Amino acid sequence: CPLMVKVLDAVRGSPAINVAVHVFRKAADDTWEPFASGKTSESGELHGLTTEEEFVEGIYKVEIDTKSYWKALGSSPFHEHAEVVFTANDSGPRRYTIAALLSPYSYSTTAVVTN
Amino acid sequence: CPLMVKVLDAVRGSPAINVAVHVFRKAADDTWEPFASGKTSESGELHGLTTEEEFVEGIYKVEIDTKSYWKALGSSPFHEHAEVVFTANDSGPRRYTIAALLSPYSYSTTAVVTNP
Amino acid sequence: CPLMVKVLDAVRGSPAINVAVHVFRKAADDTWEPFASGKTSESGELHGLTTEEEFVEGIYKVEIDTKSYWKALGSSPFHEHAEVVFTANDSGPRRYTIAALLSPYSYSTTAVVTNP
Amino acid sequence: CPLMVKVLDAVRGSPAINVAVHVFRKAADDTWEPFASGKTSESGELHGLTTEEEFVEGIYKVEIDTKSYWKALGSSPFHEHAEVVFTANDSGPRRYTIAALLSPYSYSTTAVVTN
Ligand SMILES: O=C(O)c1cc(-c2ccc(F)cc2F)ccc1O
Ligand SMILES: O=C(O)c1cc(-c2ccc(F)cc2F)ccc1O
């Protein structure tokens, strides 16, 4: 599992469950090509998005559908979604975890890149 | 000033100076049209992007060019940029501050929205 | 003004107003002596805690009373307070801004340090 | 394991390894009584701090020795340490994870409270 996403809720202090996540890869013409997608589990995590073979070097975008998440829990959110854009490189320690911590008017994201 | 951007550096404990910022607005045809751009000052602030008259209702994307920032300082950052996407002015004019706190592998963004 | 505190609310997208703040300085005997206190204004800022003359070298603790803040608004927060502990002025006088972004189960703090 | 601590490094995008963590419980006279301590593992995590039997309701402080961490990696840090102070309550979902994301001049902390 080369790419995992983890989402936390800063208002409730809990995993953010059932949040839709879409991953895109940048095409040569600069458009965003659908790559992988899913919904976070009960633990706020989304595993199995891709495989080593398919996850080649390139620029990727992870879109987290935060707006629907907040609305469903009776909060008025600011963002349309959270976006995380980065380059996957074969040099580094290439298990990538993209983590996001969500509030109605703020979010923080970090990358934990290991092996 | 209805739309301001402020950027801080969490490594240095200082404003993030000379950071490029590009703003886009989603057009009727659903693509991202250029709306405004600028660079942060020595205080890490960017004012004068737009006017109340031009800043109509819409979905806006504020792209903060963090990679170029970290690279010009000699770091090797993770993200290409920090992107903040939001609906604005859908209940009448508001004033928006978009604030970002940067580290090489992480960033946080918050919005302060005032004045109905 | 050598020491300022700014507090933002990530739930509302606004300044965090009327937040109590207590500052302490570690004394020779190694306990925390009261140093200054105040409350944030409608802009979420607290100025005038101390003067350059009084703000000597030392280890300082800035306690931001987040629990009382969330409770007065009717929330049930996790933390008792947010605490920021740092050495100040050990290379001569500096100006410190301590900034905090609050959610009920999380907070972030950053320092902007200027002016040698 | 009722209380776990996780520490991440925002500069390197990695777990913060070998970071000392001290937990204290507030005594009736308002002093901080040592409770548990350890060093984070290779995954940035510290497990086994306490047991269900010992972790009674009360106010606790988690001190993360961030200053030594940064110095050892050649960074000039701002904080003496990071402190997280909270009340443990028997009502809620009582597995507590205290997570901290560290930068030289900033840190963010969140609580993920589950069952
Ligand atoms: O901005 C972020 O993504 C962030 C992430 C965490 C964090 C906490 C616990 C964990 F298992 C992973 C995380 F990334 C903790 C604080 C934080 O700000
Ligand atoms: O995620 C963010 O947008 C963020 C913002 C700040 C902050 C600091 C100072 C300030 F004037 C405004 C800010 F939003 C401080 C920490 C932080 O994580």
Mutate to test the interface with B, among D7, D9, D11 (most CBs of B within 10 A): D11
List % helix, strand, coil for chain A (3-state, nearest 5).
5, 55, 40
B contact chains, 3+ CB pairs < 8 A: A, C, D
Q: Are C106 and A103 in contact (CB under 8 A)?
A: yes
Q: CA-CA distance, B59 to B81, in Å (whole number)?
A: 19
Please, what's the b/e burial string for D39-60 (b: 16 or more CB within 10 A of its CB; e: otherwise)? ebeeebbbeebbeeeebeeeeb
Cβ neighbors of C53 (< 8 A, separation 6 or more) are none
**Taken in order C74, C79, C84, C85, is the CA torsion positive or negative?**
positive
CA distance C57 to chain D (A): 14
Q: Are C10 and A9 in contact (CB under 8 A)?
A: no
Of B80, B87, B113, which has the smallest distance from its Cβ to A85's Cβ?
B80
Q: CA-CA distance, D61 to D49, in Å (whole number)?
A: 13
Cβ neighbors of B79 (< 8 A, separation 6 or more) are A84, A85, A86, A111, B66, B67, B105, B107
Q: CA-CA distance, D102 to C108, in Å (whole number)?
A: 10
Going by alpha carbons, the residue nearest to atom 2 of ligand 2 is B109
Could you identify the residue written with the tokens 């057009």?
B27
According to DSSP, the β-strands at A106-114 and B106-114 are antiparallel
Q: B83: annotated binding-site residue? A: no
Inspect the interface and report whether the beta carbons of D107 and C109 lie closer than 8 Å: yes
Among A66, A21, A63, which residue's Cα sits nearest to residue A39?
A21
Could you identify the residue written with the tokens 């790419």?
A3
As for chain D, the residues directly before each break of C–N over 2.5 Å are none
Inspect the interface and report whether the beta carbons of D87 and C80 lie closer than 8 Å: yes
CATH number where C107 lies: 2.60.40.180
- Which two three-digit tokens encode residue B38? 């600028």
Which amino acid is residue B21, in one-letter code? Answer: V
- Three-point CA angle B64, B66, B70, nearest 5°: 155
Going by alpha carbons, the residue nearest to atom 9 of ligand 1 is D99
Residue C92 DSSP symbol? B
Query: How many separate domains does chain D show?
Result: 1
Q: How far is CA A81 from CA A22, B66, D40, in A?
A: 11, 19, 33
| Experimental approach | X-ray
Could you identify the residue written with the tokens 């003067």?
C51
Domain enclosing residue A19, as ranges: 1-115
- Ligand 1: atom nearest CA of A110 is 3
Q: CA-CA distance, C3 to D106, in Å (whole number)?
A: 16
CA distance C22 to chain D (A): 15
